[PDB]
Amino acid sequence: SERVVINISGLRFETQLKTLAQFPETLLGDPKKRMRYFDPLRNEYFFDRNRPSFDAILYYYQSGGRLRRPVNVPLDIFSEEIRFYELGEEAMEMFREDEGYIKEEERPLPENEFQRQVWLLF
Amino acid sequence: SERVVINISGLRFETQLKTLAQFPETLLGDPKKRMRYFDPLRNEYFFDRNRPSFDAILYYYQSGGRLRRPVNVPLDIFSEEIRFYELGEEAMEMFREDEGYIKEEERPLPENEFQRQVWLLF
Amino acid sequence: LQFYRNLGKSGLRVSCLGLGTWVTFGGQITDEMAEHLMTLAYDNGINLFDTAEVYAAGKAEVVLGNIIKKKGWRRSSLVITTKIFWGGKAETERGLSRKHIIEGLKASLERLQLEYVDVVFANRPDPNTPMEETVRAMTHVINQGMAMYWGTSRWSSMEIMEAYSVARQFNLIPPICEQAEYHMFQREKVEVQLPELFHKIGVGAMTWSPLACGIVSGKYDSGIPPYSRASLKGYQWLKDKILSEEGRRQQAKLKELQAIAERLGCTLPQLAIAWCLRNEGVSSVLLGASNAEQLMENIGAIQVLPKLSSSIVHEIDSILGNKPYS
Amino acid sequence: LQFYRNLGKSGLRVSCLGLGTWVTFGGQITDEMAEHLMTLAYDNGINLFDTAEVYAAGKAEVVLGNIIKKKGWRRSSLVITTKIFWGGKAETERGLSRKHIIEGLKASLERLQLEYVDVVFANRPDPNTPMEETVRAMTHVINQGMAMYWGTSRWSSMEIMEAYSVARQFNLIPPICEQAEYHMFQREKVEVQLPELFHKIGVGAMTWSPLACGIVSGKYDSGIPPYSRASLKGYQWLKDKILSEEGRRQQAKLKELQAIAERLGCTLPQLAIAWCLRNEGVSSVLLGASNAEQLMENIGAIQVLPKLSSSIVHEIDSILGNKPYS
Numbered sequence A, B: 001s002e003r004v005v006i007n008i009s010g011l012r013f014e015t016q017l018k019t020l021a022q023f024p025e026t027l028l029g030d031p032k033k034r035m036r037y038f039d040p041l042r043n044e045y046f047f048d049r050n051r052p053s054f055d056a057i058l059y060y061y062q063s064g065g066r067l068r069r070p071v072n073v074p075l076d077i078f079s080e081e082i083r084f085y086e087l088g089e090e091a092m093e094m095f096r097e098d099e100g101y102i103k104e105e106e107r108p109l110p111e112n113e114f115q116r117q118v119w120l121l122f
Numbered sequence C, D: 001l002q003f004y005r006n007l008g009k010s011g012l013r014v015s016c017l018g019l020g021t022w023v024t025f026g027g028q029i030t031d032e033m034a035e036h037l038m039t040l041a042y043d044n045g046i047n048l049f050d051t052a053e054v055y056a057a058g059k060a061e062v063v064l065g066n067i068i069k070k071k072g073w074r075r076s077s078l079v080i081t082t083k084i085f086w087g088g089k090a091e092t093e094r095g096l097s098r099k100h101i102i103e104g105l106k107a108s109l110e111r112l113q114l115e116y117v118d119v120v121f122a123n124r125p126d127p128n129t130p131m132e133e134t135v136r137a138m139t140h141v142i143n144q145g146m147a148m149y150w151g152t153s154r155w156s157s158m159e160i161m162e163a164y165s166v167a168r169q170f171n172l173i174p175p176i177c178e179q180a181e182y183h184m185f186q187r188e189k190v191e192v193q194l195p196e197l198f199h200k201i202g203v204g205a206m207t208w209s210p211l212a213c214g215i216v217s218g219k220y221d222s223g224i225p226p227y228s229r230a231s232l233k234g235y236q237w238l239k240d241k242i243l244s245e246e247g248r249r250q251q252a253k254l255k256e257l258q259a260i261a262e263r264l265g266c267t268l269p270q271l272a273i274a275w276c277l278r279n280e281g282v283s284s285v286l287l288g289a290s291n292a293e294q295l296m297e298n299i300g301a302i303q304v305l306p307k308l309s310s311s312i313v314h315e316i317d318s319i320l321g322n323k324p325y326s
Ligand SMILES: NC(=O)c1ccc[n+]([C@@H]2O[C@H](COP(=O)([O-])OP(=O)(O)OC[C@H]3O[C@@H](n4cnc5c(N)ncnc54)[C@H](OP(=O)(O)O)[C@@H]3O)[C@@H](O)[C@H]2O)c1
Pocket: C019, C020, C021, C022, C023, C024, C050, C051, C123, C153, C154, C179, C180, C207, C208, C209, C210, C211, C212, C213, C214, C215, C217, C219, C227, C228, C229, C230, C269, C286, C287, C288, C289, C290, C291, C293, C294, C295, C297, C298
């Protein structure tokens, strides 16, 4: 129940340690990864980053997995924040799907020299 | 006129005790229900929850009943917050109506074995 | 069953029973008797003694201090508390202004021949002094090593909460205890208002007049005994209460309570005192005594405490018919 | 190779080895021997001496103080530390309440004939006292010039972090050190829990019983020698450990460690002490000694420190087979 204070460029966020400990493999969930951002003088973790985005990042832990991009935050900026906080590929995949994306197919000519070469001009 | 400080995941809210005492049957209106969330070290009630939603929750008490969902908050998330703060079914009903909902009808075959059974395949 | 208790949620451990000095010390009883009462209490594990600048115009503190000095008890084994508010005839010698709290406590400490008290109490609320000034002054005397903690007396829960919020606002020290009147005929505050403060901000209750000045002892069942507090010069007000219409009503109810005492196998005073300690919210009860007999009997209330079952408590509520609405 | 180290991240510089007074001073050894041990340590650059109100019921502090006063060493050249918690039989004479910390430290300072100690430690955690009260009291005695810094002893890392957050919350002073037990058969806390506190909030470790009361010296390889701590009246508990089933197991492993000592060219005690200093998280190790021979040998652990290679450390881990999981 120990509380944690995360300061996003001046904007103060507060949560419980158990809330973050829920997702260990993320930056805020792993003590060794967030250690770098701790300010022992103010007893808070400080990130010189985008403010509007963190709300959703924190809600992700509080909700237990809900990663919704705030209406007022550009998809390119929010996606960078998701990657910075290391939420993982599963969450990222779940995210792009909802944002209306996903899809990657197309093998490739194995018989190199011949097939693969012909299948490229056809 | 005593003042109350409610801290929503770091976001600081402040109001008068009489404003909350207006709706006793809610979590914030009932001393016994909010007692659990009090932090005697900082003299505030702390909730590890969704930030964007609380604005409207507090305005509900200040306005005397106006429960409007913030444009930037998903209906599914706001509805959960309304239930958590225990605003009551009347407010909830009033809310869904405005949000464009409401409606539940359809009795059911009483003469069990016979009627109710036939009325299901017809 | 737990003889020692934390005063509220602080780290200060007091015996569930303490000994007061109002009326008796430096007044009704001889210094010899005072030394006897204190020795008896100390030897029985009681570590809490309460006094006030106003009791016998300061003589109570002088007597209390002479005993402690004479007995040579280790200061660390005692919990001395004193109250401030009425310190003299002059306009500036009363109240909870920074001036009187500092001067008042300094003078009490002088009469007590002690470097400090464990808890200093505002003897009553002060409408003429802003809360900030009072909390800053109490915090000041604690930082000066004049007191270890401070508490309130006769303050409403609203006022206690104000002192607490003011303390948090300015990084000052909140009060840790309220000294409230409590006995079978005065239950409101301790049962309805204080419990919330106890659980919310840790303020505990240290109750006084558990026998309502002797009224609940049953000694006034038929008239004003000679040498009883009610007969003392200056306590006509108490005599008026006992003989009043409501006074007669109380005495009548006490005769009903006597049967409860016999069933529990104790005397009425023991039942009355044990009753006050039945709820966690009460940290300690300050006793009064004009002789050793009274003190030895009263201390026995601790043996009764375990027998106060829900059933018995409900029964006493019926007889008293004054249980406060929550 | 660095004889002097910062205590945690504070500016206080202590020798990597300090001398304690538990069991010995005012107890097992003569004041003459105590003066000899202290002189030897001081002349060898050790500037850290630890004592406690509880050791020999205060006599240890009295002996420590008599030596400092007699030798006339400059106060500024010493780092005296003392622990508070058990200060007497009375209910209020124990714990970390504001009352006992102030009275306890004041009394220790009196027995030490010193105006102040460099570091005052809460000898152990106190469940009955809110953290705020404790941190405010420690901060208070520091502001009064009674201590320069404060530390914890036997506190979990969770409790140490609580004191730190409470200090930040109220603008108080955080603790700078934890006095933890540490030797080859008690590695958990110092190796798994404390390092994080060291890097995060700068709290350093000052370890005690590096030889597990003598057990790791190898002197108990075959029975309880006469005059050893395990034979002293009152340490039957230690004797029980040595002869226990687990006791025999340890002694067996020590015979395996002896080969490591010979390879490094040192005695077992020197290896055991040097082992404790192998990681930065440990600021200093408090030694114990009943005679000058023991102290002169133990101080030699500093020459071994440089030889403790990863390979050697891995080897000792195999023999002990008790390396804690991170
Ligand atoms: N915070 C405040 O403003 C405040 C106000 C008042 C008091 N107090 C504190 O509370 C303490 C206790 O108050 P209190 O004196 O009113 O207490 P109490 O318990 O209500 O009354 C004690 C008095 O009743 C009589 N008595 C006690 N035990 C008896 C027994 N077993 N049999 C017969 N008579 C008995 C004695 O008077 P007689 O023998 O003379 O009849 C004795 O002096 C004070 O001394 C003071 O420290 C605080």
